[PDB]
Design a protein around this ligand. Structure first.
Ligand SMILES: CCc1sc2ncnc(N[C@H](Cc3ccccc3)C(=O)O)c2c1-c1cccc2[nH]ccc12
Ligand SMILES: OC[C@H]1O[C@H](O[C@H]2[C@H](O)[C@@H](O)[C@@H](O)O[C@@H]2CO)[C@H](O)[C@@H](O)[C@@H]1O
Ligand code: NA
Length: 513
């Protein structure tokens, strides 16, 4: 389905795609291979959907956080640069694109948010978030505002949520999520109070914030290096500086490494490798992109030495040092989708801060919490003995959902023994290969009819029945992948229903004696 003898590239619309296309023309001139650069809307959502059917671009550019998800789904070619090419880029950029010991993309540049301020309106930018309300009152009396930034993407609010101890995953422990802790609460509350006191508007998005800054209407914005081009064109006299502190502690932006992955379904992997290594990741390649839209601190040592003398890059790396490199684990997508909803609902007043971050924590934890219950149930049902290991500090829900599942699920397997036996015989489960086939059948079953806890118990109960069969034919190693696949079907298709029911707390409540 992907065309051979051509390269199709996807990069986000905020990046230097015209610069990338010039690197495309230079590749074409030397090789006769035409490079097409596109910047589709929502390309980070659209890449996994199309790559999963063997379609999509040859090369996808995004920050590294989304790449572990793509790799886990088998959408990325492993990349195998030799040592001499590996030595040309900073090792911490290679660390960003390493997943289960394999390099799954080419690192391009380090991106961190900074405070951007209008020197003509604000010769001394504020050192603290706390002084912004008084600053705004001062600027409002002159027909100006203190601060506008994109409130529709959690990326921009994360530095404030994280300042006082909010975090995604403790360093990575997927069982330790910091989304609804007191630090996160205090940061998002400060944001909601800015909106309440009319210092910020809940509806401000990327476009509105950028135009207000670039027209001289607001003294400050929060943005990455890619934004500096449009500000150059605007004639605003701007500085790039350290983000304001919150409760005496630095803002902690999530650091992204813009990265180039190769589609596992691409029949042009050698052309893509040849383009990325010998045309893009060179002084002339990164300069062409950078001249269009600044990349940040580039992964290529030679060109990073030239760019590091720029104070805007110095300020970028200062904010980076005070932040954290984003995780690349597959959970990141669900984390971002949850926190995006929480910031928007808290900002608009649809939910209180406590409600919004509670739901975001449940969303962020949903996959791992589901897998822990389902996997323990399938394994104890198969072997006749429970797992003795502790769930941990935050798994009272896990213990109670498993106790509920045992009590309710005993009945379902006994009543459906004959139906389950027939269905198991009608399928041909014998190994890991057959377990992959099961996912289509289970999705197929879960795409028709009503959503309720009884139907979920029936799916898991079928899972336990299959796990018992697997154990009997010495295929015990297939039980964990079965559990992964049942968990996948369940959260893909029912994520929002499960968050609405308060996840597994709802399941315990619904069947409570
Ligand atoms: C992969 C098999 C699976 S997983 C699964 N998960 C949830 N629900 C299912 N079915 C119930 C309907 C139902 C009730 C009793 C007996 C039979 C069906 C529902 O849709 O609510 C199934 C099935 C399934 C589907 C059709 C025939 C089947 N016979 C054995 C299992 C099974
Ligand atoms: O808003 C959540 C979002 O944050 C990051 O996306 C950034 C991206 O890294 C930057 O390169 C720039 O394009 O702005 C984006 C924010 O709108 C994560 O990389 C992304 O996965 C996540 O969804
Ligand atoms: Na976007």
């Amino acid at each position: 389905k992907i065309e051979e003898g051509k390269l199709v590239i996807w990069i986000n619309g905020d990046k230097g795609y015209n610069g990338l296309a010039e690197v495309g023309k230079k590749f074409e001139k030397d090789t006769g291979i035409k490079v097409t650069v596109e910047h589709p809307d929502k390309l980070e959502e659209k890449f996994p959907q199309v790559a999963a059917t063997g379609d999509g671009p040859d090369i996808i550019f995004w920050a590294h956080d989304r790449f572990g998800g793509y790799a886990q789904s088998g959408l990325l070619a492993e990349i195998t640069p030799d040592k001499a090419f590996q030595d040309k880029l900073y090792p911490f950029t290679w660390d960003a694109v390493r997943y289960n010991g394999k390099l799954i993309a080419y690192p391009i540049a380090v991106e961190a948010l900074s405070l951007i301020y209008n020197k003509d309106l604000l010769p001394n930018p504020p050192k603290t978030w706390e002084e912004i309300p008084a600053l705004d009152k001062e600027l409002k009396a002159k027909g100006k505002s203190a601060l506008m930034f994109n409130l529709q993407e959690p990326y921009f609010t994360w530095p404030l949520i994280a300042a006082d101890g909010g975090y995604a995953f403790k360093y990575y422990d997927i069982k330790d999520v910091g989304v609804d802790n007191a630090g996160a609460k205090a940061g998002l509350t400060f944001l909601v109070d800015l909106i309440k006191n009319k210092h910020m508007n809940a509806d401000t998005d990327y476009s509105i914030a950028e135009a207000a800054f670039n027209k001289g209407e607001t003294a400050m914005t929060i943005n990455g290096p890619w934004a500096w081009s449009n500000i150059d064109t605007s004639a605003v006299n701007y500085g790039v500086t350290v983000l304001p502190t919150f409760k005496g502690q630095p803002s902690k932006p999530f650091v992204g490494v813009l990265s180039a992955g190769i589609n596992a379904a691409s029949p042009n992997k050698e052309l893509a490798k040849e383009f990325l290594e010998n045309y893009l990741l060179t002084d002339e390649g990164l300069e062409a992109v950078n001249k269009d839209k600044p990349l940040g601190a580039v992964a290529l040592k030679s060109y990073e030495e030239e760019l590091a003398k720029d104070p805007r890059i110095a300020a970028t790396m200062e904010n980076a040092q005070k932040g954290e490199i984003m995780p690349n684990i597959p959970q990141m997508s669900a984390f971002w989708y949850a926190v995006r909803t929480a910031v928007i609902n808290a900002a608009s007043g649809r939910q209180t801060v406590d409600e919004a971050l509670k739901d975001a924590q449940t969303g962020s934890e949903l996959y791992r919490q589901s897998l822990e219950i389902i996997s323990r149930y399938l394994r104890e049902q198969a072997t006749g003995a429970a797992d003795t290991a502790p769930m941990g500090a935050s798994g009272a829900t896990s213990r109670k959902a498993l106790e509920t599942l045992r009590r309710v699920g005993d009945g379902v397997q006994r009543n459906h023994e004959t139906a389950f036996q027939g269905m198991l015989r009608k399928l041909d489960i014998k190994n890991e290969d057959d377990v992959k086939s099961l996912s289509r059948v289970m999705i197929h079953v879960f795409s028709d009819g009503v959503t309720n806890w009884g139907r979920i118990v029936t799916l898991i109960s079928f899972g336990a029945f299959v796990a018992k069969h697997l154990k009997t034919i010495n295929q015990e190693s297939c039980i964990e992948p079965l559990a992964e696949s049942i968990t996948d079907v369940l959260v893909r298709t029912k994520r929002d229903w499960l968050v609405k029911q308060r996840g597994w707390d709802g399941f315990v409540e619904f069947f409570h004696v």
